[PDB]
UniProtKB/Swiss-Prot annotation:
This is DNA helicase MCM8. One of its GO terms (molecular function) is single-stranded DNA binding. The gene is MCM8. GO terms for biological process: DNA damage response; double-strand break repair via homologous recombination; female gamete generation; male gamete generation; mismatch repair involved in maintenance of fidelity involved in DNA-dependent DNA replication; protein localization to chromatin; protein stabilization; recombinational interstrand cross-link repair. Belongs to the MCM family. Changing P76R: In POF10; inhibits protein recruitment to sites of DNA damage; shows significant reduction in DNA-binding affinity for single-strand DNA. Component of the MCM8-MCM9 complex, a complex involved in the repair of double-stranded DNA breaks (DBSs) and DNA interstrand cross-links (ICLs) by homologous recombination (HR). Required for DNA resection by the MRE11-RAD50-NBN/NBS1 (MRN) complex by recruiting the MRN complex to the repair site and by promoting the complex nuclease activity. Probably by regulating the localization of the MNR complex, indirectly regulates the recruitment of downstream effector RAD51 to DNA damage sites including DBSs and ICLs. The MCM8-MCM9 complex is dispensable for DNA replication and S phase progression. Highest levels in placenta, lung and pancreas. Low levels in skeletal muscle and kidney. Expressed in various tumors with highest levels in colon and lung cancers. Keywords: ATP-binding, Cell cycle, Chromosome, Disease variant, DNA damage, DNA repair, DNA replication, DNA-binding, Helicase, Hydrolase, Nucleotide-binding, Nucleus, Phosphoprotein, Premature ovarian failure.
């Protein structure tokens, strides 16, 4: 009933899991506001931009998401996955109905849709970003200083279990090729999988790394303070959205980087959205 379930979740689909409640919550939101977005631009770019003020809007459309501000902040990777599958389920239902009338007068293949929330608040200044912010969703605003070149990045790798024939979409931590340890089905644990590099469950998107420097008051906050910087990882439609010197607003997830000048603990922002003025 959920085509594209493995495009967002590595778990096995079960109607008893708490994910169903969250997914259907955004599904009600996206069905009522489907005319507010361009369904053609969503499918082409593979993403959707949602205003955070629309989600925190009081009323009837946001009836099933009263705690979106806390869940997105403390569990962004789980909230965006449900929000992404929801819009994918809304689009796959709106297109299967369109293809139903064409047949009378049904394989609709909707690709992965990145759920991208912008205009998130409160804004977090870079100096107050501590190590405790790991896994949290925040919004930054700084100057672009460096923009690396675009490179491919294998985010997920499909694996076929030789026991039951199930194909899982296994994420790679840092693009490092790794193998699953157990089959996600609750019956068998084959522990032996074959890589399906040509499978659609194997994700490969354009990757770009940019560096952001905080907005420093050149005289007020210059009383012995150095401008802090942080790396931001753009992907897919966010790639090539800013040049060095631009002032951008970035939302995303704080994560730990894994790659005298060598410090062994660096935080970066997995960019979920970027807004460039110029
Ligand atoms: Zn299996």
């Amino acid at each position: 009933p959920y085509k594209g379930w493995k495009l967002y979740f590595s778990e096995v689909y079960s109607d008893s899991s708490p994910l169903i409640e969250k997914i259907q919550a955004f599904e009600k939101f996206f069905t009522r506001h489907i005319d507010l977005y361009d369904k053609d631009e969503i499918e082409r770019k593979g993403s959707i931009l949602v205003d955070f003020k629309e989600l925190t809007e009081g009323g009837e459309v946001t009836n099933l998401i009263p705690d979106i501000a806390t869940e997105l902040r403390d569990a962004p990777e789980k909230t965006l996955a449900c929000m992404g599958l929801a819009i994918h389920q809304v689009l796959t239902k709106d297109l299967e109905r369109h293809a139903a009338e064409l047949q009378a007068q049904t394989m609709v293949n909707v690709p992965h849709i990145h759920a991208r929330v912008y205009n998130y608040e409160p804004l977090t200044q870079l100096k107050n970003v501590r190590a405790n912010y790991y896994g949290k969703y925040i919004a930054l605003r700084g100057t672009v200083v460096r923009v690396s070149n675009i490179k491919p990045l294998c985010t997920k790798m499909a694996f076929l279990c030789a026991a039951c024939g199930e194909i899982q979409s296994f994420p790679l931590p840092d693009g490092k090729y790794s193998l699953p340890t157990k089959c996600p089905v609750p019956v068998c644990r084959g522990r032996s999988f074959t890589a399906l590099r040509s499978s659609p469950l194997t994700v490969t998107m354009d990757w770009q790394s940019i560096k952001i420097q905080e907005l420093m008051s050149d005289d007020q906050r210059e009383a012995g303070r150095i401008p802090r910087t942080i790396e931001c990882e753009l992907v897919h439609d966010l790639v090539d959205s800013c040049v060095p010197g631009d002032t951008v607003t970035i939302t995303g997830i704080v994560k730990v980087s894994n790659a005298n000048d060598k410090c062994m603990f660096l935080l970066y922002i997995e960019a979920n959205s970027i807004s460039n003025s110029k």
